[PDB]
């Protein structure tokens with residue numbers, strides 16, 4: 001029905017495919033950051049996951065914040081003591097963009113345990129907006145996933161939650177996921193979820209829609225599968241905790257498959 | 263981008279609202295006439311309406327969508343520089359009392375509004391406030407969607423978004439009836455109301471409250487049941503106690519409208535958001551078979 005905008009679905013998917021290339025962060029940015037590392041970014045993204053749980057923000061909001069941060073850090077050097085300010089301001093902007101009821105600025109100041117002032121948060125907000133030139137309508141893994149989900153026969157809630165979980169895990173690790181576009185991560189996550197739960201594969205209908213095959217998705221899939229297999233041991237655990245909740249069908253408790261048989 | 267701000271010469275105030283003054287101004291170097299919307303900054307930082315307006319209009323480049331030219335982004339003020347347009351459709355309707363708007367102009371304007379809207383929808387943007395005051399016309403015959411402060415980037419399939427939304431007279435029944443989800447069809451409902459309004463110069467459903475608005479729609483189009491709109495009786499704010507009004511001939515709803523016009527209007531005002539016509543499909547309606555783009559018949 002009109003909730004899946006049949007007359008526009010394909011125009012939208014095309015347009016998002018075009019924009020994810022323009023909103024892509026620079027793949028080698030961390031190497032050009034003197035003071036920060038992939039591991040500090042992972043700490044930060046894991047903290048944003050907790051903040052989104054504390055305020056019951058949309059997952060889309062989280063994905064947008066991470067995109068904003070990664071684009072900002074692609075052109076702005078940041079000291080480690082200020083990384084969280086960038087992250088706080090990113091989450092504020094994403095909330096304002098995406099949420100019906102965003103938390104107030106004071107709640108963002110509060111959650112940084114008063115490391116930062118309200119003035120600093122609002123000043124960083126303005127700097128992020130200028131650095132990103134207000135281009136906040138970025139495509140996310142989620143926006144692709146939700147369209148891929150329409151191709152399931154029938155829809156399966158475990159598959160959907162699992163795919164979101166896998167996509168969310170990818171946010172944490174810049175190495176390697178920065179080299180992959182949201183549409184590709186979404187595809188690999190959808191395939192991997194579909195396989196884990198039902199034994200099925202990336203369907204022909206999504207080959208038609210995306211132009212992607214298991215062969216073109218292989219590299220991302222192999223990374224994602226390793227990430228999935230190693231997830232209990234990763235230093236960052238907020239996504240796994242989050243996806244134990246019934247809201248997400250407890251999918252983080254499902255066992256990854258040992259092999260992909262590709 | 264284009265600087266600026268010392269390059270602009272304010273000519274006069276043209277509008278207000280939030281946050282929220284609009285001036286007419288002229289670029290002193292290029293001669294370009296612009297509309298400057300000033301947004302005062304501060305204790306919650308940059309307002310979310312502005313964040314949406316700007317981010318979404320950066321993506322939307324189209325002849326029938328108001329062009330955002332620049333954003334002048336200072337510590338305490340934010341100016342949005344838009345292309346200048348001469349009048350809003352509402353003031354044009356009022357100026358056209360006595361004659362009415364010639365059909366070629368109504369047809370032209372509807373065709374352009376539908377192009378603008380199809381473009382929004384194709385770029386995953388819901389406008390959510392289409393009304394004559396937000397539609398701007400120039401002296402060359404263009405009409406453009408404007409005021410994107412209520413707009414939103416949507417996902418496919420849609421999630422639950424802000425319930426408010428849409429000025430009451432132009433608000434679709436699935437919003438009035440509290441549906442969990444609404445989509446691109448809400449904008450089409452609004453343009454249907456606007457189509458009718460261009461023909462009559464008076465609002466089609468001028469409700470004074472949500473229930474009154476629903477009841478005015480029901481009295482014109484019939485109180486919807488499960489045949490006309492499967493699911494309606496299960497909607498959150500549907501009440502079995504709602505009066506059951508008979509659907510009128512549509513010829514009686516907008517008497518001066520021809521058969522093609524009526525057909526298109528009835529498809530834009532279909533109760534079932536699933537069956538309501540898209541902007542994309544409306545562009546191909548036989549109503550538009552002879553469409554042109556004349557200038558407005560009146561001085562702007």
Ligand SMILES: Cc1c(C(=O)O)cccc1-c1nc2nc(N)nc(OCC3CCCCC3)c2[nH]1
Nearest residue numbers: 276297344345346347348349350353396408409
């Ligand atoms: C709107 C208007 C009148 C009028 O009908 O009173 C007279 C002279 C100019 C304008 C006007 N031209 C405009 N051009 C652009 N680009 N934007 C305008 O206003 C933005 C406005 C759109 C309608 C709701 C409030 C925000 C404009 N308002």
Ligand SMILES: [Mg+2]
Nearest residue numbers: 002535536538
């Ligand atoms: Mg429809």
